[PDB]
Amino acid sequence: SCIQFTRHASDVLLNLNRLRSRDILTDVVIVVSREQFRAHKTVLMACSGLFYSIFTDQLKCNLSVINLDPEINPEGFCILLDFMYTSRLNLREGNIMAVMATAMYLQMEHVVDTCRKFIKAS
Amino acid sequence: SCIQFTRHASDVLLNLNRLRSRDILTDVVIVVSREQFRAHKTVLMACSGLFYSIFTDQLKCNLSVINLDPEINPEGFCILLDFMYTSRLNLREGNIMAVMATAMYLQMEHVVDTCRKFIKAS
Amino acid sequence: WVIP
Amino acid sequence: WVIP
């Protein structure tokens, strides 16, 4: 018999993104080629099957630095990190291939699905 | 020119609640009278003006244990902690006064607003 | 607020 | 997915 506040989840995500932009309580650096991205482990786990597997591992859960596969494009990662914290995906003709490949690697099934749909249309 | 995934914020919050239920990456214990509640600092900050103030403080941001004011009722806190992680508020005749008082202390303005509306109706 |  |  609960009541529900419709905007609560969106407002929580917006505040988590504000913490990220101000580098507050970020507890991991994701290294993609030369590029470094600071984030919250919990948000990464909540969005990605790959980060979920990494941070539930008894040894890896304690690492402050995670290095991604050298094939991963920093721009593709950046677009996906922004999606994790906002629900908004900057999908463009020039980045769609790098975004799909990064989403497949990160195990973000809904992003993979929209990328496949957009590629099929063109 | 982004696209948006409608269910993303709700799905993120659902996964954060799954991490909480399994005690994964929880980094703080909130003590309310005898009762202890494990949580994620970032989620507490995203939902509460009080926890936002506490964990942005250069000294308090590093505490693993936070003790609330002895006037705070553990059940009222538990109902509010569940709301933070789910968007669902278990508001009942027998708990509404304790929920409103706890929400005022935690600075959760939307919960305070619905409590005042429900009290006014009765 | 809604009835979920 | 929608146009926000």
Ligand SMILES: O=C1Cc2cc(Nc3cc(Cl)ncc3Cl)ccc2N1
């Ligand atoms: O496409 C995806 C997105 C995703 C997220 C998570 N993260 C969780 C899943 C569960 Cl059940 N509890 C807690 C968490 Cl943080 C796992 C796999 C995938 N695949």
Ligand SMILES: O=C1Cc2cc(Nc3cc(Cl)ncc3Cl)ccc2N1
């Ligand atoms: O009723 C409320 C809920 C709430 C949440 C937060 N938390 C933040 C606010 C900002 Cl601007 N950036 C980041 C965070 Cl985590 C502060 C005050 C209040 N009052």
Ligand SMILES: [Cl-]
């Ligand atoms: Cl996804």
Ligand SMILES: [Cl-]
């Ligand atoms: Cl609120």
